[PDB]
Design an enzyme around this catalytic site. Structure first.
Site, PDB file in Angstrom:
ATOM      1  N   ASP B  28     -15.419   8.515 -14.990  1.00 39.24           N
ATOM      2  CA  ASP B  28     -16.035   7.344 -16.102  1.00 39.24           C
ATOM      3  C   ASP B  28     -15.226   6.035 -15.662  1.00 39.24           C
ATOM      4  OD1 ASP B  28     -15.494   5.927 -18.412  1.00 39.24           O
ATOM      5  OD2 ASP B  28     -14.088   7.476 -19.330  1.00 39.24           O
ATOM      6  N   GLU B  78      -3.588 -13.203   4.641  1.00 40.28           N
ATOM      7  CA  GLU B  78      -3.190 -11.644   5.610  1.00 40.28           C
ATOM      8  C   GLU B  78      -4.963 -11.209   6.308  1.00 40.28           C
ATOM      9  OE1 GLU B  78      -3.232  -7.748   3.643  1.00 40.28           O
ATOM     10  OE2 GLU B  78      -1.687  -8.911   2.415  1.00 40.28           O
ATOM     11  N   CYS B 110       0.938  -9.966   0.349  1.00 35.71           N
ATOM     12  CA  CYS B 110      -0.121 -11.620  -1.352  1.00 35.71           C
ATOM     13  C   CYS B 110       0.907 -12.213  -1.305  1.00 35.71           C
ATOM     14  CB  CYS B 110       0.136 -10.453  -2.129  1.00 35.71           C
ATOM     15  SG  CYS B 110      -0.102  -8.495  -2.178  1.00 35.71           S
ATOM     16  N   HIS B 232       1.819 -11.885  -9.483  1.00 42.80           N
ATOM     17  CA  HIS B 232       0.345 -10.987  -8.685  1.00 42.80           C
ATOM     18  C   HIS B 232      -0.237 -10.425  -9.695  1.00 42.80           C
ATOM     19  CE1 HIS B 232      -0.669  -9.946  -5.384  1.00 42.80           C
ATOM     20  NE2 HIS B 232      -0.514  -8.839  -5.409  1.00 42.80           N
ATOM     21  N   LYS B 241       1.718  -3.294 -17.166  1.00 46.62           N
ATOM     22  CA  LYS B 241       2.816  -2.637 -16.227  1.00 46.62           C
ATOM     23  C   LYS B 241       4.460  -2.901 -15.865  1.00 46.62           C
ATOM     24  CE  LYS B 241      -0.284   1.217 -14.705  1.00 46.62           C
ATOM     25  NZ  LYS B 241      -0.055   3.017 -14.181  1.00 46.62           N
TER      26      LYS B 241
END
Ligand SMILES: CC(=O)CC(=O)SCCNC(=O)CCNC(=O)[C@H](O)C(C)(C)COP(=O)(O)OP(=O)(O)OC[C@H]1O[C@@H](n2cnc3c(N)ncnc32)[C@@H](O)[C@@H]1OP(=O)(O)O
Ligand SMILES: CC(=O)CC(=O)SCCNC(=O)CCNC(=O)[C@H](O)C(C)(C)COP(=O)(O)OP(=O)(O)OC[C@H]1O[C@@H](n2cnc3c(N)ncnc32)[C@@H](O)[C@@H]1OP(=O)(O)O
Lengths: 387, 387
Positions: B28, B78, B110, B232, B241
């Site tokens: 979905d 990278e 990163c 980041h 989160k």
């Protein structure tokens, strides 16, 4: 002042005889021994990669206090094992350095341990109780029967950079020169460099002359002002061609001294071969241990990397530095190696490309006191720690 | 004071619609649009490599004077195209920067654009008339149908570090945190990252907490001190989160402001996808351009690379910074792209892997005003320059 406080190298425990490689390759031994200027070539067993050699160079000079004080671990390499994960991280882990530290790689062919040390110094300007670990680690592998082959080598150099350093203050006079050229490079996908043999000699000498001339100009110095020069050594004769190119108009005292320093400076490199980022800094150790420079005297350093970038800076010897080098230890380290035939070197070469372990051939039971690559599993390198 | 004087990013001219990717992957759409928090993913044509993207992010922001004043060019990536020759040399050349300059790459997943700008700052302390160019440039490519696919992206971000910066003063408070973990890595030989999806969410969040905790301790600060935080961005949800894991112990006011900051900070990223080294700084541009921060306020920055290293420093908004951003051009850049179908995006995907040129599929005629990769010949990449 800020500079090189402690410094050490490591090379793998095997070498091949340059006279013997030459017979094997249909050339006159003296072409390699005198022509190229190299007597013994380091041979990589599969159980040393850049991380172990790196940890090995480091382990003898870092004390329990360094572990606490080190705020960056910087790895200079063109022989990376990851496109993302910095070798600095694993080495940082292997050495048990305090967690609050930047870890990363720098890359620009053989040049990168220079920006690493210079930027460690600028880093420390305003952090006086901290330290930096810079490791040069590399494996110059050109391929069997290649043009580059005679100049192959492997090893690493570790420098601890600090305030009030016991060995060399780095002066504030570095000047860098960049010129886009296709002397040497290794596009992703290539095991071995692409190399334009003759062009690389030209590129090197140009890079040195541009850097030196500009340095002389900004600082108002000349050759007479240096106790010694120290050069990136892809092969001992290369640094010599480059020195001879700028010393024709120096007086006779200066030529006698700088030529002679040079010989002291390339004494170790002769038995090891090219080690890319570490070559300059290995030659630095050779110089300091084989020559008897006085505290207060000044070394000119030339750092080169294919592609290309070069830099000239100077560094001033600290009193008592002799107490912080291990001449006997570095002599034991080269002399204690084991010669391998040309066939054996070739087996080793082929095993190394594919990382085919063989604990009996790498004779890992001998290595109880060093770090070594013991296995790869689920695409993660495992290491043996010194017992 | 020393900080970010100028900043700009570039992404390729194609994106794919994330709702349409979802349908082609049989989830979905809302799993990408809300679950992951990403709406359009950048698609790299063959003609846009890390060097051309890099040169494009930078060309609009360096004046003829900059060219004379830039003393180092550092590339964080990278996604490197060469094991030895730094992309920095190639970019230095495309942009015609004066030759007395250190060019080199830095590498740590990163993370590397952070040590790039922080060490540039330290470099500039005693060099009041020099500037540093730092370019982050990467293509996040996980593979067709891989777990990582939804978070792919490609772009670059470019930063001129200088004295008396127009935009942000870089504070003296950075602290980094290294923890050796196997969340993400790419051994040489692999075209795609080895990833452990769930571990990497944990390692990210753990790295942020450690770094944040140590910063607070050292600087005697709390979240209430910060106008906004910037993280980041591997996907917009991840930063949300990580944020939510630390702001539960903060008054409603700090909570409302910081959560809102976050949202301005990730506006652009929503339309590009992950860009590894550039993700934090892309997000920095989006924050400075979407939010209305006052001169004098303070941004708290978190930088992260897999494997893993992270870092927390602060930066202060300079009087007049608004006169120095390009909001309309950045909106224009995003809006001026052409949507490709999922089949098209997969064709671009395989073409990139093999560097198969096709002038009509890449519509190179369109690219007269930008740098682009026009050809590889005798292993040398050739570039079209802005007409
Ligand atoms: C990789 C890097 O790190 C890049 C750099 O630093 S740039 C500068 C260094 N370049 C490199 O190392 C790149 C890789 N190296 C190579 O291509 C090659 O190994 C090489 C160019 C160094 C050797 O080339 P070669 O074709 O085997 O030998 P060649 O160049 O013919 O000459 C070698 C020496 O042998 C010498 N000579 C030949 N036969 C001899 C003999 N029988 N006895 C004594 N001397 C002899 C000399 O002729 C020559 O030295 P001179 O310049 O003093 O004349
Ligand atoms: C490379 C790096 O740069 C490394 C790092 O920074 S560490 C940061 C994270 N790592 C990476 O970005 C690289 C790897 N990426 C990945 O592994 C994956 O693409 C991923 C972990 C981002 C997602 O994988 P996935 O199998 O789609 O994970 P999934 O369990 O679906 O999680 C996605 C979200 O979908 C959501 N959800 C599922 N169906 C949904 C729907 N129909 N509507 C709304 N939400 C939905 C959420 O359940 C779930 O997140 P929450 O925790 O917010 O609930």
């Amino acid at each position: 002042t800020i500079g090189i406080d402690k410094i050490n190298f490591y090379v793998p425990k095997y070498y091949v005889d340059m006279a013997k490689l030459a017979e094997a390759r249909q050339v006159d031994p003296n072409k390699f021994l005198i022509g190229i200027g190299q007597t013994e070539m380091a041979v990589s067993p599969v159980n040393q990669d850049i991380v172990s050699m790196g940890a090995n160079a480091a382990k003898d000079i870092i004390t329990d206090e360094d572990k606490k004080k080190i705020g960056m671990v910087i790895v200079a390499t063109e022989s990376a094992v990851d496109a993302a994960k910095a070798a600095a991280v694993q080495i940082h882990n292997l050495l048990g350095i305090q967690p609050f530290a930047r870890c990363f790689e720098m890359k620009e062919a053989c040049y990168a341990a220079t920006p690493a040390i210079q930027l460690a110094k600028d880093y420390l300007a305003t952090r006086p109780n901290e330290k930096v670990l810079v490791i040069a680690t590399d494996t110059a592998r050109y391929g069997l029967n290649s043009g580059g082959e005679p100049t192959q080598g492997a090893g690493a150099v570790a420098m601890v950079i600090a305030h009030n350093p016991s060995i060399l203050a780095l002066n504030e006079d570095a000047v860098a020169y960049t010129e886009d050229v296709y002397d040497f490079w290794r596009p992703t996908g290539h095991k071995y460099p692409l190399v334009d043999g003759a062009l690389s000699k030209d590129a090197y000498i140009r890079s040195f002359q541009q850097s030196w001339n500009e340095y002389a100009k900004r600082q108002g110095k000349s050759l007479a002002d240096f106790a010694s020069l120290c050069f990136h050594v892809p092969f001992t004769k290369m640094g010599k061609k480059a020195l001879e190119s700028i010393i024709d108009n120096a007086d006779e005292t200066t030529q006698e001294r700088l030529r002679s320093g040079y010989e002291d400076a390339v004494d170790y490199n002769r038995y090891v071969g090219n080690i890319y980022t570490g070559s300059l800094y290995l030659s630095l150790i050779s110089l300091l241990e084989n020559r008897d420079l006085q505290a207060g005297e000044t070394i000119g350093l030339f750092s080169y990397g294919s592609g290309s970038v070069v830099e000239f800076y100077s560094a001033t010897l600290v009193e008592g530095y002799k107490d912080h080098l291990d001449q006997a230890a570095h002599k034991a380290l080269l002399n204690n190696r084991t010669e391998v035939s040309v066939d054996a070197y070739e087996t080793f070469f082929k095993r190394f490309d594919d990382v085919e372990f063989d604990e009996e051939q790498d004779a890992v039971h001998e290595d109880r006191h060093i770090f070594y690559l013991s296995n790869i599993e689920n695409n993660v390198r495992e290491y043996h720690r010194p017992e």
